[PDB]
Amino acid sequence: FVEMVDNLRGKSGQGYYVEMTVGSPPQTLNILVDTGSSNFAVGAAPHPFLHRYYQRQLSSTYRDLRKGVYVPYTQGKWEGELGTDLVSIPHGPNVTVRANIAAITESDKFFINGSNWEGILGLAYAEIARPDDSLEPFFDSLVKQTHVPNLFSLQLCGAASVGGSMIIGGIDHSLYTGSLWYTPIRREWYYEVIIVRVEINGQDLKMDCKEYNYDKSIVDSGTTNLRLPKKVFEAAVKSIKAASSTEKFPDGFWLGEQLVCWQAGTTPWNIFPVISLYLMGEVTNQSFRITILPQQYLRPVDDCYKFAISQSSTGTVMGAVIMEGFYVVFDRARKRIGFAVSACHVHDEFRTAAVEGPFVTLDMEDCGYN
Secondary structure, three states, X not given: OOOOOOOEEEEOOOOEEEEEEEOOOOEEEEXXXXXXXXXXXXXXXXXXXXXXXXXHHHOOOOEEEXXXXXXXXXXXXXXXXXXXXXXXXXXXXXXXXXXXEEEEEEEEOOOOOOOOOOEEEEOOOHHHOXXXXXXXXXXXXXXXXXXXXXXXXXXXXXXXXEEEEEEEOOOOHHHEOOOOEEEEOOOEOOEEOOEEEEEEOOEEOOOOHHHHOOOOEEEOOOOOOEEOOHXXXXXXXXXXXXXXXXXXXXXXXXXXXXXEEEOOOOOOOOOOOOEEEEEEOOOOOEEEEEEEOHHHHXXXXXXXXXXXXXOOOOOEEEOHHHHOOEOEEEEOOOOEEEEOEEOOOOOOOOOOOEEXXXXXXXXXXXXXXX
């Protein structure tokens, strides 16, 4: 597992990527690790923002599936040819498998000018793969063609260049401290989980647990910050702008519109409230909690910081902001996601992030949106 350590790189705000090789001879590409989608798609044409791209034509192992694919977004999209080829992860398990590849030949608002990645690795379930669930996701094809245990873990470390680790097939005790707690994967499409309670500085937000999972809650390494629904969002700010009211910030900051700055070395961390997310446990009426420090939701850019915790209207998304404080275990084999304080978390000299339990929480199911 140590060979897989520190196998993820990136730039704050634009996700983490892992090196991969496709085709014969192997072609090297940097791929975004996105637990929020399910397609393995790489640029396969000279788009100007690309450092390099997959060249099917030169892979003696490529196989055109004579089938195209279109993936639209709120404003952008990507399209390309389907096929398969021998895939591998240099700094991952010493294996090679034949996986489906989407050769992107046209896209818009997909690639990022400046970024060092050329493709995306959707690690979620087929249920949301495009064009349809028939397109077997990479991880699925991996576990099948090999003896790599059906699970992977992520240790996103943030900082500007960021780093992280993607342990495929197992757990590396060196990446976390303390206890590992598991929340169930409600449904195998997105990595869906259930938030049954939220606290700020140890104080409940006093809200029906259903409003936390409207219209769903997911774990996604492909999103930058914590994204709560409106009701949850406002409530979360109202309490935070009030928790650190010993100062003042424009209406822009609390929207990522603008930021705040303080002499290097002298940041008022102590005035900012920790956030507690209570996740459904493995046992009936049992839950546990994870708490995020200010560092997590105040992303750097003297010292200046932008407000991560942004609104949302597509359910709770536990992005990098969240995931960077913990070592997340995507135990696919047992339909569950585990959490544990990451060994690469930035802490205060006073406070500390945690993952504690068990807690008694009744009727957690009613928190699930339908």
